[PDB]
Design a protein around this nucleic acid. Structure first.
Ligand SMILES: O=c1ccn([C@@H]2O[C@H](COP(=O)(O)NP(=O)(O)OP(=O)(O)O)[C@@H](O)[C@H]2O)c(=O)[nH]1
Ligand SMILES: O=c1ccn([C@@H]2O[C@H](COP(=O)(O)NP(=O)(O)OP(=O)(O)O)[C@@H](O)[C@H]2O)c(=O)[nH]1
Ligand SMILES: [Mn+2]
Lengths: 628, 629
RNA sequence: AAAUUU
RNA sequence: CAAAAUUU
RNA sequence: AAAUUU
RNA sequence: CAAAAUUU
């Protein structure tokens, strides 16, 4: 009741942005700063019909592939059935009563189920292109057949142990010791500091979101785990409550090639919240301290690299200092299985952008153990009072990464027969892949110095990584290319992709700004396969179009036109409504600014008078000093 | 959707306090710090039945009194009918279609309706005969036509006396800090945006909706129009073209009324246009913020701003004691509207009078009103001279609203007060105007004591004096001088009289004396059973809040009232105590004593000390990572 | 809430 | 969405 | 949101 | 709740 008028106006503002009908009415006359758009190609009805037709074909293709028989799970170790956890937190079990329980045994059921975006594509683009694009890739749960095949490939690959030491990791993966979290502090506070996905599964035995399981984890399971860690008593705990150390093997819903649905569906592992949270203390602290290649010339690390705020140009600057192959250091930087390589032949700069196939399967136990050691050691050198505890956590970490028992479908509990091979989904997954990859390329570079310059060639490179590192180069990814070291306006560094994107130079006045880029076809693939009321659907179209523009679609003339069309199609009320109000849009100029070294600024408003129109008030200066 | 666990816990905490069902489950049986309470007298069904029975009698009494004929409104000037305002703000009229409009004329309909959980609680925990007689004596009601018109006439037609007043005299009685005054030479929009108001109060004509709903129409449309016409000396053009912009509504106040006197007494007030009140509030609120009170400055007669808390109750006593021998040295006099505390000595002994004026607004003369407006405007322009002319124009509007505004009552007929004298209660500054008139009269009273007229201490001559010399009527039985207990014993009263509706009492804390407000049980009980007013939960929560409020105001210092409020508090379900709406605390005796003392502020004690952790299902446990393994 | 990436 | 990096 | 006061 | 003062 008793409120200042200023405050009252603010309250009215918030409330107003929730009333769609009122927004629609107040914005109805407003000047709209339209995005650049390409013209319509056909009407709603035709576009919907074409979308329906494509969706219908995809649905049958997916349903057929999902119907395929899957091969036996004999390649895994069998450990029988596990009893459901009996642990109570107050008046309820930590494992909910009616869930994931077949006659007292833990059970799971894999889901393999069978577009607004697609309609937009047909509305604004050539039918044949949209149709062939939409029929090649689909966002899907995948297939049993594909799931099991990839699982086998991930769990039974012949690996090679890397030759690694702390000295070598210090060189390739330098970090700032002062940025490491003081893990000598009290454990509860440290755990409370970790970030996570609130709606991700908390794993066994919570069988609900991390948000829902949080109290059960912190108040009940974590102290129990701590007590048993510090008393060297984990085996008692494991035997009495096996579900506390159980993972779930899941099929990843993803953008999969329709052609290969029955051969390829990615598995990952969801671990218990209490274990992942504990390991995250070390892992997230270490991530925060890690340098990237653009900050330290010895680092092979791109885990942490950003294209924005000069990053794209930093990559180029870093790359150019690469030396003559066999004489001076190349420039190599790794992010998981994805690597950018620069070297000179007769002073000319070359680039390779190779990838590894099902890489996690090739990550050897030595590399995993060395990475855990390096992270643990980094912390205990800086905070020595807590050495023993964190070494124990180190052991759990390694176990989760290599040997965790797991469910797939039903009650049968499996384990990977060999220790080698990374259990994708463990905390630190990406770091493990990055390190394995970097050790291999570090060895590769050493061999160049010893004179073996034929390792620059596809044939010998593929042989080398297979034989010497147990790593499989993805077909067609070893294609050295002459780099455009100083690109012209609108020209590319090379046609190759690193971290899914090409590097290009665009003009601003007479300056060159380095920005990400892809051909239209790639942007279109992303557009028509979203990674998923009428109002929320309309708003999602708006948001996805903005996102793609920002990522680099704005620098492709056809993609920019498509995204702009979608943006301009979004009703004013949907643009301006309160959301989890973002009523700006990525203009070309703003996106260029984002990738440049400019100070951060807000996206331009779609409706510049929205604030005042929504409030039904535009301030007018009234001077109290006037002569009367 | 990626957050820290700490943040996730915080989100869960906020959500949890809104999930009543979950709160109910988690706090069921929780360790509860019970308030002191008197025992149950009867159960709910019996108490509800008794409440129903009392409510039924009150309803008939009110309905009968509302049926009484009212006297004609011929004592006011008639101005005919006003056309509804045609001003548009964008796609809508400022005066909404189909409201307050009788065939194109502004119209209004007075509401006198004949419409308790509180009463049920009273019966649950107190003697039936006492609750019943208490509840039948006072009711919260719209009042009556008969009573409304009688008080309206008394307010608009009283023979007033012009005060002898000047800036010099007001500086003396109403000192202020000039440095606290708002810089009113700033830009107008910013100044207006800075005023506080009641969001759900009527915005008046021509908006005919809440201030919250009318705010854009006011700021964006009407206020600039008003400003343009002010600065061009063109207000009469505006008045003629859009009369509704300068129209008030005369309304009946819903209030606690004696059932006996329903047909004789219902308070009238005036609701003015938002644009005019907002403008004047810039000056008035600024001035209120600068005003000193009697406990800060020995010359001040002003209690507008006084607080009983944080030593205030003791400050009153300290201030009072320095009163001198009547006819030799200054008394101690302090005014808040029509309510005044007076201290003097006869043969060195301290006496107290707590007189009140009857329908005081009717007695406030136009000279006093004009002087107060001048004093406030001048205070600002002395500090910020660049804006003199504008604020003098606002000064003129201010006077017009407080003495001569045209107004509706019921139907389309527009009235005006025939005489300029008499305050139109509801204008911005209402309380200050009353306070000043009252203080001028008492200042004169005190002067006459010095000139030798010591019989003005006596009821007979005091009443005569205020009537004849100031046009003010002392309410009967409010002039009763009393020997003050200057150093009160533990549990003793300063005197039995009320100032600002409360007695002053001394309570013991260890071996210290703390000065606190107090009333007899019957008064607290009257307040309890007549709330100044939806789920069962919100009703239960309101009971909890009213019980706490009364305790804090001083009910905690009466044994039976403390017991009643405590019983209500202890009856409140845990979920209702702990839900999102300080909130989950209760006023213990010790905490309330601390509030009235000069102690630093602290939170009320928790009803459920471990509520936070129980609700979260998490108690932090220290786990040491430095352990040897 | 959204986009890209691994 | 299992862990994650980069964006607004 | 709530109590008292004018 | 017409303007308000004090308080939680
Ligand atoms: O969502 C993801 C995608 C990829 N990765 C990591 O990326 C690495 C390789 O990805 P992958 O092992 O999942 N299969 P992939 O190599 O993509 O097969 P292909 O279709 O031939 O390219 C693995 O080591 C994963 O751990 C993730 O951790 N999460
Ligand atoms: O709710 C209120 C009460 C009082 N007042 C103002 O304060 C003045 C005195 O306040 P008052 O409330 O004590 N009563 P008064 O009308 O003088 O006589 P009576 O009814 O017999 O006790 C009134 O005359 C009004 O101007 C208000 O503005 N609002
Ligand atoms: Mn990959």
């Amino acid at each position: 009741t008793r409120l200042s008028l200023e405050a009252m106006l603010a309250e009215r503002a918030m409330v107003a942005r929730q009333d769609l009908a009122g927004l629609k009415r107040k914005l109805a006359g407003a000047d709209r700063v339209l995005a650049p758009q390409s013209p319509e190609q056909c009407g709603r009805e035709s576009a919907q019909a074409q979308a329906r037709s494509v969706t219908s074909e995809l649905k049958s293709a997916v349903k057929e592939a999902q119907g395929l028989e899957h091969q036996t799970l004999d390649f895994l170790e069998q450990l029988g059935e596990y009893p459901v956890c009996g642990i109570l937190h107050g008046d309820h079990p930590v494992h909910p009563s009616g869930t994931h329980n077949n006659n007292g045994k833990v059970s799971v059921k894999r889901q393999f189920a069978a577009s607004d975006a697609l309609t937009c594509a047909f509305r604004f683009e050539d039918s044949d292109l949209v149709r062939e694009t939409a029929l090649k890739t689909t966002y899907t749960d995948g297939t049993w057949a594909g799931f099991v095949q990839r699982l086998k490939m991930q769990t039974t690959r012949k690996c090679v142990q890397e030759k690694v030491s702390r000295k070598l990791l210090k060189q390739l993966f330098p970090y700032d010791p002062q940025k490491l979290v003081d893990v000598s502090g009290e454990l509860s506070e440290l755990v409370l500091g970790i970030k996570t996905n609130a709606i991700a599964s908390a794993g066994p035995p919570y069988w609900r979101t991390k948000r829902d399981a949080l109290p059960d984890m912190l108040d009940c399971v974590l102290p129990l785990l701590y007590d048993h860690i510090v008393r060297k008593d984990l085996t008692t705990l494991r035997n009495k409550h096996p579900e506390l150390f159980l993972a779930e093997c899941k099929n990843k819903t993803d953008r999969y090639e329709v052609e290969s649905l029955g051969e390829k569906t990615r598995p990952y592992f969801s671990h218990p919240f209490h274990l992942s949270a504990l390991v995250s203390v070390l892992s997230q602290s270490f991530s925060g301290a890690l340098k990237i290649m653009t900050e330290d010339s010895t680092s092979f690390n791109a885990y942490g690299f950003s294209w924005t705020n000069g990053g794209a140009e930093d990559l180029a600057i870093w790359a150019r200092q690469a030396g003559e192959a066999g004489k001076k250091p190349p420039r190599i930087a790794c992010y998981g299985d994805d690597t950018d390589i620069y070297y000179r032949k007769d002073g000319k700069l070359y680039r390779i952008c190779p990838d590894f196939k099902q890489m996690d399967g090739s990550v050897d136990a030595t590399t995993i153990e060395a990475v855990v050691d390096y992270v643990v050691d980094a912390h205990v050198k800086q905070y020595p009072t807590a050495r023993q505890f964190w070494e124990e956590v180190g052991k759990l970490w390694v176990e989760m990464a290599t040997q965790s028992p797991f469910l797939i479908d039903g009650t049968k509990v499996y384990r990977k027969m060999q220790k080698d091979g990374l259990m994708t989904g463990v905390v630190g997954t990406t770091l493990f892949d990055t390190v394995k990859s970097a050790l291999a390329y570090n060895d590769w570079a050493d061999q160049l110095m010893f004179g073996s310059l034929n390792l620059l060639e596809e044939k010998y490179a593929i042989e080398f990584f297979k034989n010497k590192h147990g790593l499989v180069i993805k077909e067609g990814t070893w294609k050295p290319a002459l780099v455009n070291e100083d690109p012209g306006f609108g020209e590319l560094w090379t046609e190759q992709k690193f971290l899914g994107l090409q590097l290009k130079v665009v003009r601003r006045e007479n300056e060159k700004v380095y920005v990400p880029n892809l051909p239209f076809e790639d942007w279109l693939t992303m557009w028509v396969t979203p990674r998923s009321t009428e109002t929320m659907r309309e708003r999602t179209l708006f948001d996805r179009a903005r996102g793609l523009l920002v990522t680099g679609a704005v620098f492709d003339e056809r993609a920019r036109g498509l995204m702009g069309a979608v943006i301009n199609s979004t009703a004013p009320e949907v643009v301006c409504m309160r959301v989890q109000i973002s009523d700006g849009y990525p203009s070309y100029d703003w996106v260029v600014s984002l990738y440049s070294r400019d100070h951060p600024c807000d996206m331009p408003r779609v409706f510049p008078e929205a604030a005042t129109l929504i409030a039904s008030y535009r301030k007018q200066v009234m001077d109290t000093r006037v002569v009367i």
